[PDB]
Design a protein around this ligand. Sequence first.
Ligand SMILES: Cc1ncc(COP(=O)(O)O)c(CNCC(=O)O)c1O
Ligand SMILES: Cc1ncc(COP(=O)(O)O)c(CNCC(=O)O)c1O
Lengths: 410, 410
Amino acid sequence: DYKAFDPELWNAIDAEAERQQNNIELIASENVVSKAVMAAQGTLLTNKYAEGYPGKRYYGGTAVIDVVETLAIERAKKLFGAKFANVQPHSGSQANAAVYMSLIQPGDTVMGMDLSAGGHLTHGAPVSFSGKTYNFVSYNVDKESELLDYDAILAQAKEVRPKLIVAGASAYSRIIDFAKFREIADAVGAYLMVDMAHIAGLVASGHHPSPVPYAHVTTTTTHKTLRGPRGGLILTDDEDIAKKLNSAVFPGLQGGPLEHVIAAKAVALKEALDPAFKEYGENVIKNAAAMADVFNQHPDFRVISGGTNNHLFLVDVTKVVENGKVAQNVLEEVNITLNKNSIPYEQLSPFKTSGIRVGSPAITSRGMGEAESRQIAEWMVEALENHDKPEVLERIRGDVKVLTDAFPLY
Amino acid sequence: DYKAFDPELWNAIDAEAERQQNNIELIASENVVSKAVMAAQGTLLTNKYAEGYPGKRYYGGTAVIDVVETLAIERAKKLFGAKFANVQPHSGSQANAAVYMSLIQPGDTVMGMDLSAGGHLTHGAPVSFSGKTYNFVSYNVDKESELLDYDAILAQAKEVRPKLIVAGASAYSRIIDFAKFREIADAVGAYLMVDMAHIAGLVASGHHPSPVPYAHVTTTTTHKTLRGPRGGLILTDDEDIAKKLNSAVFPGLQGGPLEHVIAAKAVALKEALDPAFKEYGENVIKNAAAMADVFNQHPDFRVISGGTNNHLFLVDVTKVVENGKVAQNVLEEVNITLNKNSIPYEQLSPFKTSGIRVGSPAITSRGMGEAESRQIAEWMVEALENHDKPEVLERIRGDVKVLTDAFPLY
Ligand SMILES: Cc1ncc(COP(=O)(O)O)c(CNCC(=O)O)c1O
Ligand SMILES: Cc1ncc(COP(=O)(O)O)c(CNCC(=O)O)c1O
């Protein structure tokens, strides 16, 4: 009945479902969640106000909510090996804000990865509250290797004297050495915060090393590789920091939490505890590597750092099309959606960029394997090399429908 | 059948659905959303990253999200009579942070309603980002009348000279005069921001005059009287302000918006544009006045300000029990949920308080009318008077059950 009351809206919703089905989604930060995760978010837990924490709420009627939120906290702790977790943050951005509010004061100096080399807005962009409220100094990757250089970062930290060093990225493909990051922090008396949003699913699956034992605080989105609902999570092993973080999230930054989304976080966390989640990780890794190999081997394309050891990579497209916006547009013409992306030391406009970013998680969740991944990468190459040949694009689009038909979304 | 995979979680959701069904929910900030609102939040829109705004997004394949977000925006504009809307804020709290970021600077001075008299945490509590970043100086209500004194407030503003005045409350039962707050702001060169979270539904129905033509910026939750999903929303008629508001929400404070929630916002807003929504407004007013009438007349209970012209009211219970907190524990024992609440010039610990806050929107959304409202108040009065007599509560509990069964939740 309700779809009949509001056809403009439900038309659009059904349209997005079909668009997800008919597109090869390579946006590295997307995934395809389980029906269970969506169903948890679609429940009447949305009607409950629950300011406060389990056992100390500011409203009655919260005993069941407590069981739910407590499930979520305990499942995170268990899955990531942390002594404390906070599952209330609305987003990754909010989780990160809460941590800054807990460990440093406005105007304090913070080191963060450079936007262009893979850092997130909340790691010090001047347009973000992060850059506005704190004095962020950025570190980069090496210009020749495109890898983190832990000695250079140490040398810079010794000069800069930060209160906090932030590690983690949106577009770095290689394994990060968290033990080195903590060594660096320790050497200049800084806190270390790790934002593992992109890699949390791989930390869970055993395919990326955990920052949890080395960071004072670890943040993540519950979406992305962890294949959860859209939201945030915070972890730590320090009881005192945990009190500060809890106060920072509420009443410091947020009001009432989204308990329906929290339910959905509990769902996702239990899915990631299942042994099958190790299989998903292994496949995420293989699928991304297979796609990258195609570009490595092709002479007109270069993969940043020469490859990947996680779920994503970047490709410099500028020998074949003008810039990354162009490549993003062309691939979209063949129902392959990704995002243009700055590469390290990017020479072009931020609105244009020299690169594209590709990820495996969504296709891996639809059940695709190495060969499909390889084929996709061939079609991307082919579409960019023939971007001005409508007839080729038309043909690729049809080949892609065969593949999407063959691995249905749900 | 995924519920079989996680029975702890899903049993808990069932428990909460039965708690909500067998409970008279009088927490004034709660409501009961339509199946359609829940369904929209349970969609696969949760899979989609949409940093940016309609037409100017960071990622590809966002043409359908844009239709959905544009519906929410267009509906908020039609419904509230505003020229601009931003529907991305994750919460009421995030919405208010964004306005401050847009209109004033850290350290600037702001007047907002005092917490004891029903201002919100984000209107200046020293444990909120609001009081930590900006110099909040509170106005109160008259000590006698327990009403807002616009003369007193004008004079205080003339001493204080705030950059911004914030009006709106979580616990004031009377009409707020937004024309007066704007003439007050105007007299000192201040912006006026109204946070209408509690009354947005009544504004929507015509039962409370609107702040929108008087406030430079209006904020609200989408949950509460507007009967929508948990979320925030921001309105203005000034274009230059709108641009800032948008930059503040993203990349200023947030990252990716919750487009499934935004779909749900769109749903709720079309519901509120339906002429049936005015009938709901009407009953919300009446049901609250009826529950309030019972306490006025009872000699052991005073109702703050003497009564109400909106969806809520406060009651001093200290005659009959020690404090608000105790009231709340007792009433919960008969399946009546509300919250303890400071009364103006609260004497007692804020962990205790002298009052209860009562609201009609949830019970009105279940179909109850004046007789049931009145009866519910009788039951409350009765349970507080008989608070250590378990055989009585047991009886009230049973009579409550008849009424909850009679007005089933969905
Ligand atoms: C590392 C990192 N941290 C925080 C966030 C922010 O999360 P919210 O959008 O939930 O605020 C992101 C999003 N990154 C977007 C991307 O790479 O596509 C991120 O990659
Ligand atoms: C006036 C007002 N403004 C903002 C908020 C905060 O919204 P979020 O909780 O979505 O951040 C509230 C919550 N008020 C809680 C209550 O009345 O019980 C509020 O009452």
